[PDB]
Subunit: 216 residues, 3 copies
Amino acid sequence: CLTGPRTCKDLLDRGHFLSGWHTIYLPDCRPLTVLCDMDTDGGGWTVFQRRVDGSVDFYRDWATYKQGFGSRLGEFWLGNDNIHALTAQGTSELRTDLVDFEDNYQFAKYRSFKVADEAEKYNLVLGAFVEGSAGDSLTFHNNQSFSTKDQDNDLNTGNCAVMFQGAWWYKNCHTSNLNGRYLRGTHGSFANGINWKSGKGYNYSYKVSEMKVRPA
Amino acid sequence: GPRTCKDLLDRGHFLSGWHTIYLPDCRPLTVLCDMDTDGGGWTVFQRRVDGSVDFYRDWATYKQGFGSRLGEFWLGNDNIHALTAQGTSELRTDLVDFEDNYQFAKYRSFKVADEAEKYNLVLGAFVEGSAGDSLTFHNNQSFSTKDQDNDLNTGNCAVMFQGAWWYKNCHTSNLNGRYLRGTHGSFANGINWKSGKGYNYSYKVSEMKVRP
Amino acid sequence: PCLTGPRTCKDLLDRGHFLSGWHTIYLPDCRPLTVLCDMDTDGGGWTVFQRRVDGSVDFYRDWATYKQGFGSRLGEFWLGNDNIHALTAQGTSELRTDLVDFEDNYQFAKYRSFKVADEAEKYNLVLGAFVEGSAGDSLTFHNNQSFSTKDQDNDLNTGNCAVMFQGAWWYKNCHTSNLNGRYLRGTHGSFANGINWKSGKGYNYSYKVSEMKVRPA
Ligand SMILES: *[C@@H]1O[C@H](CO[C@@H]2O[C@@H](C)[C@@H](O)[C@@H](O)[C@@H]2O)[C@@H](O[C@@H]2O[C@H](CO)[C@@H](O[C@@H]3O[C@H](CO[C@H]4O[C@H](CO)[C@@H](O)[C@H](O)[C@@H]4O)[C@@H](O)[C@H](O)[C@@H]3O)[C@H](O)[C@H]2NC(C)=O)[C@H](O)[C@H]1NC(C)=O
Ligand SMILES: CC(=O)N[C@H]1[C@@H](O)[C@H](O)[C@@H](CO)O[C@@H]1O
Ligand SMILES: CC(=O)N[C@H]1[C@@H](O)[C@H](O)[C@@H](CO)O[C@@H]1O
Ligand SMILES: [Ca+2]
Ligand SMILES: [Ca+2]
Ligand SMILES: [Ca+2]
């Protein structure tokens, strides 16, 4: 409803100062309950990805990544249809917040972030890297289909989602793997964790990870 | 508008959480929906997770419900009846020990009568379960709180085992017992499932949930 | 809609919401606000305006932030001083403090009345009789005190209490309680800069859980 809230940004302007699950209205005016981060970097971010404790299985198939999964009480992926619905007219920016197991925070911010629809297999349109202490380990994945174990759309003679137990805009294969296994800090296994290459490397799996959008 | 966690899943709520539904009498009830386990679409009426909430409670409290949407809770006997009376609901219990071993038992049908009949347990055959069958034993028995004794033992099961349950003479499951945190010396007064981890082990997590 | 609907967590309990959680109530001015209702503790029906539970949220914050509120419905939060005032402006609500240590010991402390003035009077605290509580009175001490943050010193100490004790509070000179202090996780060497309650576990112990909540008497 034109005079209803359509982003976490709106809700903030309208005086909801507490982070939490609010329902918003998408461009097409269908209602959708989302998590609003009202605290970080000015606040007003819609969170589409959350990892926090390893409670939820993220090594999932296409249908599952399509529709979303997890729990409002915990970890979740908002779902690719929704993430597209939310970024349709790409004027909204991306923030990535990582917290390690000693509670050290790092992050990264992009100017624009858009995922295409299923027809173009949730393609990643990412505008410029603006800054962040995590370094830029997403640009590398610009202009690439999203792949999962049962649907391969990567640039690797093998199946990247299996080789790195995740779901992602995989090329050959990745520099970031935020949907990887919740490995809890330093791990021997190679690059199959919640990893950000310019952050804590290919052998460290963050304690917390959030991916979130706001109109620019 | 929706009448079960099952409906909500059908209409495309894929994320577990607290949604409001509509009882067949029509009072709306905000319930926890487990959209993940075993196909999803389960309404959770009991959750233990961390020992934050006191479960050694009286009749009025078990009647109306207690605890926190943020944590542990009992949905309340009136609601559990409202919720399982009309049409047939299937039970299912998920159990997690402190060494993270997942377990369950699952029943064809599960119904609790109203207060007049003491929220009596009406249970169907065991479908399957790695936790074994530690509930059929309690079928056709009244509910008992500490302050109310409907148990078929001349002592007071509820107080001997500090919980609440359709206690008989007395129990082979005690999912509303004390949050004892794994192995305990004390006898059968924990979150215990006899064919599961035994009378001397209190699970880390416990959930009781229903689906059409 | 402002009239038909609920105005306190007490009403909601009366209306048959038996489960603790976030419900919307209507301020005396008709503005909707989403509050946390503790339907379980001490008869139930309490509106929670402060919660600490895991150390996930930064509480060492400025005036504007304490004014408007901050944190997460999923976790820790301060409801905001304007709201806490809005809620107690009619002067007839009981205060309850629920604390839990890292041994799972539960202590509480209760007061007959609790009111914070508006911003003009710097959220001045008006507190009534200590009714009882296993945690001891560590609040009466802070009667009649303005609320202070790091960037706005309104205390009775030639120095800055919020800085020294890394929190925010009705600091006097400075405190016997510091429930908005740093989440230090049990025993700490540093002096009185934790989630501390002096008559409770002392100046060198930071509780695992803390909640401050109100209910119409
Ligand atoms: C709350 O505390 C105040 C003082 O604290 C200030 O105000 C509060 C609300 C906050 O803003 C704080 O930050 C401030 O620091 C107490 O006020 C005092 O009360 C006592 C009585 O209990 C008064 O004592 C009287 O003194 C009078 C003397 O003449 C004049 O003195 C000064 C000038 O020197 C003048 O400001 C004052 O108003 C008098 O005109 C006299 O009437 C009589 O003999 C009596 O002894 C004292 O004056 C008050 N102080 C101030 C700063 O005005 C409140 O009592 C307390 N409230 C409660 C309920 O406890
Ligand atoms: C873990 C996962 O994502 N797999 C699914 C579901 O999508 C599959 O269809 C099913 C196999 O028929 O397993 C599960 O039920
Ligand atoms: C809560 C609040 O308003 N304070 C902020 C910011 O303004 C501060 O500079 C910082 C202190 O280094 O804490 C925070 O980052
Ligand atoms: Ca391939
Ligand atoms: Ca008896
Ligand atoms: Ca000062």
